[PDB]
Amino acid sequence: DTYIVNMDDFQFTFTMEFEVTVTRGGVHKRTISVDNGRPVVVWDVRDPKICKICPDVSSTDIEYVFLDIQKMRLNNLLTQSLWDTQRICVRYACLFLGFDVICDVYHTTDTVRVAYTGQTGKEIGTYMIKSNVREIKNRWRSTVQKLKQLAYMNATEVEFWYNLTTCVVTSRSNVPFTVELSLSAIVTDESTVDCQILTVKAPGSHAQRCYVTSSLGWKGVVTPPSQYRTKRVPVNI
Ligand SMILES: *[C@@H]1O[C@H](CO[C@@H]2O[C@@H](C)[C@@H](O)[C@@H](O)[C@@H]2O)[C@@H](O[C@@H]2O[C@H](CO)[C@@H](O)[C@H](O)[C@H]2NC(C)=O)[C@H](O)[C@H]1NC(C)=O
Numbered sequence: 001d002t003y004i005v006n007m008d009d010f011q012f013t014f015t016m017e018f019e020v021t022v023t024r025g026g027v028h029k030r031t032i033s034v035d036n037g038r039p040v041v042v043w044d045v046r047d048p049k050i051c052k053i054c055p056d057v058s059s060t061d062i063e064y065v066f067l068d069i070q071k072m073r074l075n076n077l078l079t080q081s082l083w084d085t086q087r088i089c090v091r092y093a094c095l096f097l098g099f100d101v102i103c104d105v106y107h108t109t110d111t112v113r114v115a116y117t118g119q120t121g122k123e124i125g126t127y128m129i130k131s132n133v134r135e136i137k138n139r140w141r142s143t144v145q146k147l148k149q150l151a152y153m154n155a156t157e158v159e160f161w162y163n164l165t166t167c168v169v170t171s172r173s174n175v176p177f178t179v180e181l182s183l184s185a186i187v188t189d190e191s192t193v194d195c196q197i198l199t200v201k202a203p204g205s206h207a208q209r210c211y212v213t214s215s216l217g218w219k220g221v222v223t224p225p226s227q228y229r230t231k232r233v234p235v236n237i
């Protein structure tokens with residue numbers, strides 16, 4: 001019931017990263033990521049791409065409005081007084097602890113990098129986030145818990161075969177991870193708001209192990225290479 005949801009909203013700790021990039025020539029981008037992972041919501045230069053297990057983000061939701069305001073702010077900075085730069089980016093990296101928030105705020109231009117660390121909003125930018133912590137946590141908690149579980153080793157799919165050895169690792173989480181062969185390699189990182197597909201191929205390789213290392217704090221192995229492309233899960237090693 002509502003009572004228990006409230007307590008869980010408070011107790012669950014996580015981070016959200018809001019980022020906006022504005023470039024001279026009309027190319028902008030707004031994104032939301034959680035737990036310092038890949039973006040789960042992307043607005044490209046329309047409607048955003050929103051991860052399937054993400055809450056809906058309408059034009060009036062706090063997340064959308066925060067990013068919209070930052071975008072307008074950055075446009076102003078370019079037009080007003082930043083001609084020594086072709087682009088500007090702002091990033092709010094916020095920790096939601098209880099109903100408190102600590103954000104590190106980063107601004108980047110061609111020649112200048114700025115960081116305001118440890119902002120609590122108690123500077124205006126963080127204030128808006130701080131003032132809406134309960135709503136944000138309530139909206140995102142379930143999404144963030146699922147994203148962690150989807151990052152588990154046993155939710156990770158691995159196609160490790162030989163034709164020329166290839167290892168394709170698929171994850172439905174935004175949690176970062178790396179894929180390494182037991183070896184000259186080619187590494188491909190394809191990602192959408194919904195999944196990550198990391199492929200490592202080494203031509204003329206007879207590597208017998210494909211390792212998967214997760215930011216979540218785990219490492220697993222798939223071995224030996226198949227002759228066919230079939231999905232398996234990494235084994236703790
Ligand atoms: C899937 O695996 C998890 C445990 O996976 C490990 O721990 C994760 C935190 C992550 O680091 C993974 O990559 C690791 O491989 C299972 O969850 C555990 O289940 C046991 C008993 O079943 C329980 O005592 C633990 O508390 C659980 N771990 C936690 C804290 O989540 C989960 O059951 C597995 N799911 C399936 C389908 O088997």
Ligand SMILES: *[C@@H]1O[C@H](CO)[C@@H](O)[C@H](O)[C@H]1NC(C)=O
Nearest residue numbers: 161162163164165166201229
């Ligand atoms: C396997 O080799 C064949 C040609 O012999 C090629 O068409 C195919 O793309 C290869 N598959 C992989 C996994 O590289």
